[PDB]
Amino acid sequence: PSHSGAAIFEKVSGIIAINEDVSPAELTWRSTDGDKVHTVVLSTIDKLQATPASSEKMMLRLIGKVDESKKRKDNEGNEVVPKPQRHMFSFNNRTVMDNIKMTLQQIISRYKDAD
Amino acid sequence: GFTPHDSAPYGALDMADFEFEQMFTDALGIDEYGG
């Protein structure tokens, strides 16, 4: 389960599944059994934030990448990017966080290295 | 065919993300030293 684990999303007990096999490499999460779903792709998120090891909260949030230096123009010339959109969810296992964190760390690093 | 009938992204307001984002701001000291 290096790319799979159980984490609470949107404050609703559920499970996560990483799709590192796919080119775009994304993380898909669904409720424990609430016919719910939540999927995020690095293409929109280029950063992940997790808690420290000494901590016991086991949780990480992913950023929806910003164009601080990639913003687009419109007409005013200021050329700015809309307000970024990030997501945050909590874990419920020691390996679940590290297994995926170690996964996202690579993918993020991949999409972070390209830019 | 499938059009959104109900959707209010700005309907679930919560100040938890603020205090939660604080504990969620750079919580890793494995930076520097290479890339």
UniProtKB/Swiss-Prot annotation, chain A:
Q: Where is this region: Disordered?
A: 65-85
Biased composition range(s): Basic and acidic residues: 65-76
State its location(s): Nucleus
What are the disulphide bonds in this sequence? Answer: none
> Tell me, what does this protein do in biology?
Component of the general transcription and DNA repair factor IIH (TFIIH) core complex, which is involved in general and transcription-coupled nucleotide excision repair (NER) of damaged DNA and, when complexed to TFIIK, in RNA transcription by RNA polymerase II. In NER, TFIIH acts by opening DNA around the lesion to allow the excision of the damaged oligonucleotide and its replacement by a new DNA fragment. In transcription, TFIIH has an essential role in transcription initiation.
Q: What else is known?
A: Present with 5150 molecules/cell in log phase SD medium.
Question: What's the family?
Answer: Belongs to the TFB1 family.
Subunit and partners: Component of the 7-subunit TFIIH core complex composed of XPB/SSL2, XPD/RAD3, SSL1, TFB1, TFB2, TFB4 and TFB5, which is active in NER. The core complex associates with the 3-subunit CTD-kinase module TFIIK composed of CCL1, KIN28 and TFB3 to form the 10-subunit holoenzyme (holo-TFIIH) active in transcription. An additionnal subunit, TFB6, plays a role in the dissociation of the SSL2 helicase from TFIIH after transcription initiation. TFB1 interacts with XPC/RAD4. XPC/RAD4 recruits TFIIH to the NER machinery. Interacts with the NER 3'-endonuclease XPG/RAD2.
The protein's name is General transcription and DNA repair factor IIH subunit TFB1
Stretch of the intact protein here: 1 to 115 of 642
Swiss-Prot record, chain B:
* Superkingdom as given in the UniProt entry: Viruses
Coiled-coil regions listed in the entry: none
As for subcellular location, the record says: Virion tegument; Host nucleus
Disulphide bond pairs: none
Q: What is this protein's function? A: Transcriptional activator of immediate-early (IE) gene products (alpha genes). Acts as a key activator of lytic infection by initiating the lytic program through the assembly of the transcriptional regulatory VP16-induced complex composed of VP16 and two cellular factors, HCFC1 and POU2F 1. VP16-induced complex represents a regulatory switch: when it is on, it promotes IE-gene expression and thus lytic infection, and when it is off, it limits IE-gene transcription favoring latent infection.
Q: State the family named in the UniProt similarity comment for this chain.
A: Belongs to the herpesviridae tegument protein VP16 protein family.
What does the record say about domains?
Answer: The transcriptional activation region seems to target many proteins of the RNA polymerase II transcription machinery.
Record text on subunit structure and interactions: Interacts with VP22. Interacts with gH (via C-terminus). Interacts with the virion host shutoff protein (vhs). Interacts with VP11/12. Associates with the VP16-induced complex; binding to host HCFC1 activates VP16 for association with the octamer motif-binding host protein POU2F1, to form a multiprotein-DNA complex responsible for activating transcription of the viral immediate early genes.
Q: What is this protein called?
A: Tegument protein VP16
Which species is this record about? Human herpesvirus 1 (strain F)
